[PDB]
Amino acid sequence: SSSLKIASTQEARQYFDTDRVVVDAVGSDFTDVGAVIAMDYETDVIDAADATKFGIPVFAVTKDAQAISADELKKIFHIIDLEFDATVNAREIETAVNNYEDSILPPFFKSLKEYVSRYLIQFDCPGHQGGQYYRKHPAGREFYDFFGETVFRADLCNADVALGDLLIHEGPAVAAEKHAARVYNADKTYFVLGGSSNANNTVTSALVSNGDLVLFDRNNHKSVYNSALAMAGGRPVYLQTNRNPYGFIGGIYDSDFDEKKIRELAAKVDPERAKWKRPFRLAVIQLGTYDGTIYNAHEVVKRIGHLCDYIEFDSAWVGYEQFIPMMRNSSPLLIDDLGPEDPGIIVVQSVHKQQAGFSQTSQIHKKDSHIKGQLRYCDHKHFNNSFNLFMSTSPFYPMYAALDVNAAMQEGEAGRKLWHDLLITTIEARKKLIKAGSMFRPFVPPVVNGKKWEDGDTEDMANNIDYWRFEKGAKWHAYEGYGDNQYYVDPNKFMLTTPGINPETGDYEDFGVPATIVANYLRDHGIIPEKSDLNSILFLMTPAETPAKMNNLITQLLQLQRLIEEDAPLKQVLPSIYAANEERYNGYTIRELCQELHDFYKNNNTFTYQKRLFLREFFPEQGMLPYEARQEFIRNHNKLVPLNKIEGEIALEGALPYPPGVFCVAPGEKWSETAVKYFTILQDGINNFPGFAPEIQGVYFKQEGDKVVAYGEVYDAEVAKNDDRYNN
Amino acid sequence: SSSLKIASTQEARQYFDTDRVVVDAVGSDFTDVGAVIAMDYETDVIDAADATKFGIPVFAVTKDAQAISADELKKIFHIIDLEFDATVNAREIETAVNNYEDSILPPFFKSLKEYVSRYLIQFDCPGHQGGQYYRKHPAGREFYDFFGETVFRADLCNADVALGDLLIHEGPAVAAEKHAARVYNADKTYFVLGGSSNANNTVTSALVSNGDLVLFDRNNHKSVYNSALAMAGGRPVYLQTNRNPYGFIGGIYDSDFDEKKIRELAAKVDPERAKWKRPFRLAVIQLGTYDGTIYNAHEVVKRIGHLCDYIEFDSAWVGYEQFIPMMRNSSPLLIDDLGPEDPGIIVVQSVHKQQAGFSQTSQIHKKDSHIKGQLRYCDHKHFNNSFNLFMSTSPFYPMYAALDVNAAMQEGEAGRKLWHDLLITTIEARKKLIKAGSMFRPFVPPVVNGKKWEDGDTEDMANNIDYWRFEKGAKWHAYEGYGDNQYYVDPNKFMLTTPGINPETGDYEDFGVPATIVANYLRDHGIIPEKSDLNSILFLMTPAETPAKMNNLITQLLQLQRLIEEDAPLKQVLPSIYAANEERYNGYTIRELCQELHDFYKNNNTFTYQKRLFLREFFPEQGMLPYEARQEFIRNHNKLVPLNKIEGEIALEGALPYPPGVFCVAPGEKWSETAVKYFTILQDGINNFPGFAPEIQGVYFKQEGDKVVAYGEVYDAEVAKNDDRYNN
Ligand SMILES: Nc1nc2c(ncn2[C@@H]2O[C@H](COP(=O)(O)OP(=O)(O)OP(=O)(O)O)[C@@H](O)[C@H]2O)c(=O)[nH]1
């Protein structure tokens, strides 16, 4: 039933009785402890349990209670005096352990744990019924034994009515969501089991009507392009975004947050902007970019908020900013001053990315009670209708429990401490790399308050925003369109730069170490990074990291550093990519490959085109709306055209290149020269360098000769007129 | 207490306060500097301190820190901003100087420096007690004043417990050895104060049992013949070595590194080779020969390693190859792929020879953790037992400190730069001699990559192995048994050839300048060479050389060159050898002596016999094992026989001639015809040419008539049977 242990110190052992559960000593993390029982003088053990801020009941056995220190009494929960030693002490300690476990276990997981504890004969869905189908076949038996009995036993459905209703929100299911809603300072919370992709489908399909204007962030994820525009029929008013010589996904231009530019831009419909106090139904802004650019949510609401009915913050790459005091301005759920003239705030966040949750788990935080009595408001009936279009009728319970448990894990002083201790570890790890003069320098300011970054106090830096800010016009970040106190460096994204770029002069250096070499090296040495662009590599930071894990990373980056400065053979450095492509990289050394791979991108001015794709001057021309483009795609009014003949052709699918991992030509838009240039460079790179090829979606490769040519689905007006189905 | 100075530039002088220590200007080597304090714009002074890679803290006083260059910030350690000028700046600078001195001073020397700083009344060992006995007598007072107070004050013992234990390895003593062990990439490091001779006694007496097979390199030093065979009782399986027409100590034959030849050769014991996977307990190979032949340690382990439990690399003539990137393949401590089927690696190196250390200082690097759980492994208890047989109970502390300091001096980018800068100096000095068409040509390849040696870029040549390699079958080196990528030219051995030999045709030229004339000339002009063979002279290169010292050498070799090509009197050229042997060299001129001394060796075919002594076809016959031979020597079962009657007689002592400086007839072996020929030539040379006589050990000279005849201790079977002590 219960698994919580009692941690007691040696002298305190023979003073209590709950030898019902495993008692242990103190030198523990206190994560499996129910109640700590020490002596009044064993101050350091009482201080250690208290320091974790978990809230574990501390029992102090004393000789003189009237003599105990006042500061220690705040840490002690109950006093076991010696001025009776009985079975009543055994009750208090057991009741403390029970009241504690009732506290740390969230609403839905607590019920799932109890339900599974019963011996219930399942004749309902899922058909495997407690995994008993799997253990009847050898392939399934291997599947059962790999995962364990529990994941199959916890896989239940609506017919197990004791657990509530996960669709029309009833029972322990809604209790879990109402708990998360308190933890995140929101009106209502919706648990989505189809990732932020389907949560993005929920938000927009609930608010956007065919023809409504959407204030679109050009950095928006494919799901926001597909749902808000292609599916729903919304019409975008794109806001240009920043990009530096590293191709980093920066925020929206400061000059774009101007009402006069926005209304001018909104000439998609002349009257919907001309007088309408609020020309936009929805405004989707990506709060946290992949490359570490987190906005000032307070300043965004203040500047574009009175023009939008609703504002959606795709916060899938963040979420932790609510629990880190330093980053409060970045949290849209902590905005106090909301009244009826303000917009409704929706916050979509992928719990699995940088929070605690299984893959595909996400949630929506609705904060719009301040606009409750107006026509623009979207009530629970309206929102849940959309939720149910995307939510399955048979959701996976263990995934629902993960979201429930995450909300508990972020709650109070125990969750905030975990993010705080991580900052200490991350700040100390960056200092290690800076002080050790590594060629892989962390993307942070070089000088803060007249002193060097690494010369600041780690504790201050964990709670001082000056150390993590993108100062207007500062050379290091090189983003040309940032204002004062508008963007911040996301501290949880261990972003390292690699040689080859000089943000100072805004151009390439003679020698460069492409990030893909670093990526493949670490992958061969067991370390799996998140991604690597052309001159940067990323590692995601959550409380799962320990100083040991970071040191094991910093070590392997110092090994590769010396193998490069001394010029080692490619068979030695990268043996996986060699023992696959031998006759192509024969006799090569790392520097030989490094100079080769660097010059290709250098001679092609790859970062100049990477920047232009997100600049209004170079946005493709809209030859059709995204909705109209998808309809033509459904109707098969298309042709596969190669890239050399594609410029000017209307793209029916979004061209997605990595980097930046965002649409460069949205469906309906016609292929710009800039789009064709950038795609041709990466196409040639796939051919020229097998093994260090960038990921690319929206385009289709066809092997033609010795090279692999790129194609794309484009509109065919000939098939449109020669189709009697939708009128000749 | 502290002796480190602060180097500051003029403009920066009135901005700080540590007028506690001597402040100086920048135009310094930075070897006595604690902290460099310049201005942000004084880029060339900031760049100069950084270039030495010592790691000195650079303080940059600035007007605008936000404006400083990014590339310069990597060099600057701390920023002293002007946007307070106080006593806090004086703290940071003092703490930097202290943290720096704590860094560059190694573990044992740091403690010795502190201990000596105290006023301690010594009543223990050594009896001179701080040299106070010496200053009580006139002879000792002259000794005290010649060396100084410190060398006597630092001479302490075990009773000064604060310094640790140098025998059972405790305190700062083991800290020093654990530091060296990290610097040399080894498991454990043993500091030997009895030279590599006693370190060679340590290694073999710890591993070799009476009767064990030792894979013996015929080039091995006398200490390896004496300890492994004569003392321990190991039985050799000799590997033939290469010798060219210059009598240069080359490496082992390529064809000898064959398992089928080795097992066939190992028929010392038929079953110990027949099936034994590992027939050898120890294998001693001389990694770096005196004449500049350094092996490929990686290829040696790959070819004979699975046949030996352990392999010892007598690296006394090298060691610097670990710190010179170009020579990585020559370092047995940098081998990565070691598992349980590989042998244990021991590396003995004389720190005094070509590293930084006093005479008699050496160390052993043990790298055998990869074979830890097997019967063949020799743990710290076993090894330290041997260490203590040879290590004294009263070691000299200053010598221990020298080894400690050497490890610090080879550590990081500061030590590697010193060896790198030396290569530049040595490459440039060789080019001077080649381009100036000297008769003393440096032993290097004449043509590398289609261009002449001297026509290559000095920087490339310092990090390109092609310029320093013995190509298979190339005429210049004339070694007949080398394979591909097996041997390299040791760049730190300034080896010059003298006229008289033609490696092309493999024979003598008409005219020759014997190396001993060059040796005695330079010695009279103050320049002390290392050695001189018959047609070659050597100078040892360590970071102690400056381009000035080399130019002073090249000059004196150009002076002797013209005195030879114009034929100058012998009283003019060599006045030291003349004013001792006047009536013998009366009226002689250098060319008269040169032709005479050359023809003697030419008509005797001296290089043909020098080659044969290290060829298996001409190895002496083993008439007794080395151990048995020494026992007979102890028992006085011997007779002094002259060389004319010695052929066939069992040598009880090793015949050591210079050249090559290696045993030609090991104890137990019977005098070969080749041995008698070569020794007779050198014997006649002592008589014929007084003043240019080669050094010779293992043989005893007796003045008989007008000539000095050579004798040798040989076995007397008559004394053996007429001795009732060890049975009649
Ligand atoms: N998903 C979700 N459902 C909730 C939550 N809180 C309450 N509910 C469900 O919402 C129902 C109430 O919704 P409605 O009947 O529309 O009442 P309402 O909350 O006033 O609706 P609004 O007009 O949007 O304020 C409850 O009966 C619950 O089943 C929450 O945090 N999350």
Ligand SMILES: Nc1nc2c(ncn2[C@@H]2O[C@H](COP(=O)(O)OP(=O)(O)OP(=O)(O)O)[C@@H](O)[C@H]2O)c(=O)[nH]1
């Ligand atoms: N000379 C020397 N002694 C060392 C070094 N490192 C540790 N020691 C000494 O070796 C002792 C430990 O040796 P053992 O007790 O045999 O433990 P061990 O190191 O596991 O021995 P192995 O079985 O050889 O691994 C330490 O207590 C030190 O005194 C080193 O680098 N050099």
